[PDB]
Amino acid sequence: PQITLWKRPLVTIKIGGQLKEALLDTGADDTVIEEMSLPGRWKPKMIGGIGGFIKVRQYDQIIIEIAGHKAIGTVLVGPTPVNIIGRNLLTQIGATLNF
Amino acid sequence: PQITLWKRPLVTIKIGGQLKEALLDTGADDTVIEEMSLPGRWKPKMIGGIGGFIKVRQYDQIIIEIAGHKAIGTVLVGPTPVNIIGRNLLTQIGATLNF
């Protein structure tokens, strides 16, 4: 699709068999999801945004569908204000910015 | 242009007679620039994201040339770690996300 930016670029994702809403975020290096259960071991990660830095849990090689497009990659879990689909997964789905 | 997302989508902007580097950010509702002077009246705003909120000054009817494309709109000024071009100005330069 071609997604314009007059509204937030919200999509449905599927992760853990569950549908969630998330934002396609070109300003985010990484993908950050609200507290949920994911399988496997996690590693510590600090990420920084507008307000400072937060601790999150890093899960690798997680199966995730984004707007119907299949991806498998790193998902961070933590106190994010919104579910964020960042560049690590935007690249997997072939997304570009165009103007 | 077509900007891939393998790296941060940074571009040069001109604002208030000054050149800056800024991030093209579909995840941001607003455009946020590091401390600088701008003309006109302003009002305070709190904006929130990863790590919480910061206080900024809101200036209306400001022009930013973004990678050669002129856009007018609201610009927030405050202690952001990165200059952010948000959706309010991305729309004006005709930016879309494509996949």
Ligand SMILES: CSC[C@H](NC(=O)COc1cccc2cnccc12)C(=O)N[C@@H](Cc1ccccc1)[C@H](O)C(=O)N1CSC[C@H]1C(=O)NC(C)(C)C
């Ligand atoms: C994976 S979540 C973390 C992410 N940060 C990054 O990708 C990169 O951060 C940084 C890059 C370089 C220097 C930095 C120094 N101090 C902190 C962060 C830095 C991030 O928060 N990105 C946001 C933009 C941004 C990038 C860099 C610094 C600060 C913010 C995001 O694209 C957005 O728009 N978000 C996510 S939460 C809501 C919204 C947002 O912040 N909106 C505004 C700007 C407050 C309107």
